[PDB]
Amino acid sequence: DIVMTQAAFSNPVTLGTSASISCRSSKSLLYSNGITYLYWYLQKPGQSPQLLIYQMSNLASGVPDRFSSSGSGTDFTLRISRVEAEDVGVYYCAQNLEVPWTFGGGTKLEIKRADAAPTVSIFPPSSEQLTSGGASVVCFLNNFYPKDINVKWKIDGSERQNGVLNSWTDQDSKDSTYSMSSTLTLTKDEYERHNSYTCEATHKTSTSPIVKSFNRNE
């Protein structure tokens, strides 16, 4: 079978400038009839893949001329002109010169927007979770860029790393920001043995961490 190779990540692209997604095939995709059997699909965050370009030079319905594909029989690039925030997602190349259809690994397009610092919220366990015996503490960091960010938990002044897990959203379709939750998972019993709960978010927008704290007994 034919192998389609593409890089997982792109250089972050500025709104209004040009993005390029590369793809290469293990065999030429140019058939003796003059058609190159290359396709481009876009998978947007939370959605199924959808066709952008078919057989190199055809624009799928409702796709603007901003998208264009060119290349040889083996080396291809998708060009996206005047990229908009809603262009974010994973771009897949594909071939059906031969059976079976095969797909590249996908390349994520990232929007390079101006840095933005996170808005930080801390959430003590609710009475409902406590009734269940659980005491997850959540620190939410909302609408920041770029994606890389560090959260530190302090419990009564001592750093806590065990039981802490971080998870991000995808880049937002409109404001091109990320959000992430840091969750400290504790039992009610563990939770009720300390008073002060702090999360500290370190991001490149500042040298000072943004710090949120609460006291369990308030």
Ligand X SMILES: CO[C@@H]1O[C@H](CO)[C@@H](O[C@@H]2O[C@H](CO)[C@H](O)[C@H](O)[C@H]2O)[C@H](O[C@@H]2O[C@@H](C)[C@@H](O)[C@@H](O)[C@@H]2O)[C@H]1NC(C)=O
Query: Would you say 19 or 42 has its CB closer to ligand X?
Result: 42
- Report the residue from 34, 99, 167, 217 that binds ligand X according to the rule CB under 6 A: 99
Query: Would you say 86 or 98 has its CB closer to ligand X?
Result: 98
Name the residue with the smallest CB distance to ligand X.
Answer: 96
Smallest gap from Cβ 2 to ligand X, in A, equals 11
Query: Would you say 59 or 164 has its CB closer to ligand X?
Result: 59
Q: How many residues does the chain have?
A: 218
How far is residue 153's CA from residue 142's CA, in Å, rounded to a whole number?
A: 17
Instruction: Give the binding-site size for ligand X (rule: CB under 6 A).
Output: 6
Q: Is 109 helix (H, G, I), strand (E, B) or coil?
A: strand
Query: Would you say 55 or 205 has its CB closer to ligand X?
Result: 55
How far is residue 165's CA from residue 194's CA, in Å, rounded to a whole number?
A: 20
Q: Is 98 in the site for ligand X (CB under 6 A)?
A: yes
- Report the residue from 25, 36, 37, 151 that binds ligand X according to the rule CB under 6 A: 37
Q: Contact residues for ligand X (CB under 6 A)?
A: 31, 37, 96-99
